[PDB]
């Protein structure tokens, strides 16, 4: 069972492994979950958006 995702909100490491914070489509924020990177293979476009955003912020900070 796979659910449509609306946005990737965050990244973290839990015991050395990466996870991302998922906002699900048609579900409010209270239903947001941290999922392992392994689980988001089918929403990489969104993941990519999130990575770009982070990069942009880093570059704002460094300049």
């Amino acid at each position: 069972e796979e659910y449509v995702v609306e946005k990737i909100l965050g990244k973290r490491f839990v015991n050395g492994r990466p996870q991302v914070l998922v906002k699900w489509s048609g579900f409010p924020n209270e239903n947001n979950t941290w999922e392992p990177l392994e689980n988001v293979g089918n929403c990489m476009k969104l993941v990519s958006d999130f990575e770009s955003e982070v990069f942009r912020l880093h570059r704002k900070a460094a300049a």
Partner: peptide, 8 residues
């Protein structure tokens, strides 16, 4: 281009 993912 359809954005999906497994839940926990």
């Amino acid at each position: 281009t359809k954005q999906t993912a497994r839940k926990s």
